[PDB]
């Protein structure tokens, strides 16, 4: 169940989200990534920031070595952290991710965020009064370095994450552009459905990939605990009842029917096995209109620590 990207590669339309907070033991990423592959996931979304690429890579290598899948069956995404936007830092950052994951290439390498941070290995640079330290980098030069990673064969495809229309246009208009972004991975769910951005992306043959499609993990460091809980929504729950599915499955299927590639994080064996059932049923045009009606521009991520960054995309 795949979509063709604008560079000719194919992306599975359902992806497994791997982020877990630091209070989850690092062993769990290995267990749940194997469970995801066993359940039928074939797109796996990770990042240098997640501190999990060793365990996620081991899971992938394990399922290839045991004969369950071949390397070409798995679509593995990593992301360039914002302390590595300076062009000379991009290839070493990807090479380090590949060494940790024990992989020869990623299927997809993303710019994690347009909001550049002080260069270096320290992923959370903070000043003498605890403020996040920004950097000013032309993201077109970061992009040129991403392009060289594709030409070196280290990334099959390259894309971006957390870009707005203006930031996408900056790449599309870059002089001497070699490769468009294949995707823009953004926050997208029935409370923030990104309809105009989605329209724009489709018009440029850029795939919108939805994160927080089940309403986020609601980590109180990053998400307002007063925010409404997406999966408690009465329309999603009534549709779940109507279809004998679950609110999560309704929220996933909604994205597939609108041409969005959707991620789903779960570290729970039962919910991992549940989520792959998204391909078993369909929402009517009336159901889709009811879910479109939930849109309220609700951003679970309010990036408060990136206050005043010039590249803040919202
Ligand atoms: N590019 C970026 O900046 C960025 C930002 C955020 C996320 N991401 C990526 O997108 C992924 C997903 O987004 P997310 O981490 O915000 O989480 P999410 O996919 O919105 O999931 C939120 C929560 O839903 C629960 N869940 C999963 N399946 C469910 C089911 N069938 N029924 C009920 N609850 C269910 C999970 O809890 P359990 O684990 O307890 O099942 C999970 O913690 C991340 O892991 C990461 O790979 C990227
Ligand atoms: C849940 C986010 C991860 C999203 C993802 O799944 O890609 C958090 C985890 C780490 C944190 C990083 C962790 C390192 C550092 C911690 C600082 O106190 C705040 C800035 C930040 C870059 C934050 C920024 C942030 N703002 N809202 N969410 N975040 C993220 C990216
Ligand atoms: Na740090
Ligand atoms: Na513009
Ligand atoms: Na458009
Ligand atoms: Na199924």
Residue numbers in the entry: 6 to 319
Question: How did the manuscript describe this experimental structure?
Answer:
Human aldo–keto reductase 1C3 (AKR1C3; also known as type 5 17β-hydroxysteroid dehydrogenase, prostaglandin F synthase and 3-α-hydroxysteroid dehydrogenase type 2) is a member of the AKR superfamily of NAD(P)H-dependent oxidoreductases that catalyzes the reduction of a diverse range of carbonyl containing substrates, including exogenous compounds and therapeutic drugs. AKR1C3 functions primarily as a 17-ketosteroid reductase that catalyzes NADPH-dependent reduction of weaker steroid hormones to more potent androgens and estrogens: including the reduction of androstenedione to testosterone, 5α-androstanedione to 5α-dihydrotestosterone (DHT) and estrone to 17β-estradiol. AKR1C3 is overexpressed in prostate cancer and most breast cancer types, which makes it an excellent target for the treatment of hormone-dependent cancers. Gatekeeper residues (W227 and L54) in the steroid channel determine substrate orientation, while the oxyanion site, consisting of the nicotinamide ring from the NAD(P)H cofactor and catalytic residues H117 and Y55, anchors ketone, carboxyl or alcohol containing substrates in proximity to the cofactor for enzymatic reactions.
As can be seen, under the assay conditions used, compound 2 inhibits AKR1C3 reduction of PQ in a sigmoidal, dose-dependent manner, with a resulting calculated IC50 value of ∼7 μM. Compound 2 was found to display selectivity for AKR1C3 over AKR1C2 and was shown to have no off-target affinity for ERα or AR receptors. The structure of AKR1C3·NADP+ in complex with this C-ring fused bile acid tetrazole was determined by X-ray crystallography at 1.4 Å resolution, revealing that the C24 carboxylate is anchored to the catalytic oxyanion site (H117, Y55); meanwhile the tetrazole interacts with a tryptophan (W227) important for steroid recognition. The asymmetric unit comprised two molecules of AKR1C3 with clear electron density for amino acids 6–323 (chain A) and 6–319 (chain B) and the NADP+ cofactor. The electron density corresponding to the 3D structure of compound 2 was clearly visible in the AKR1C3 active site, in both monomer A and monomer B of the asymmetric unit and compound 2 was modeled with full occupancy in both active sites. The overall structure of AKR1C3·NADP+·(2) is globally similar to other AKR1C3 structures, which all contain a characteristic (α/β) 8 – barrel structure, and a highly conserved NADPH cofactor binding site.3,41 However, comparison of known AKR1C3 structures shows that the conformations of amino acid side chains and supporting loop regions involved in ligand binding are dependent on the physico-chemical properties of the bound ligand. Overall, binding of compound 2 to AKR1C3 relies on hydrophobic contacts between its steroidal core and residues lining SP2, including W86, S129, W227 and F311, with support from Y24 in SP3 and F306 in SP1.
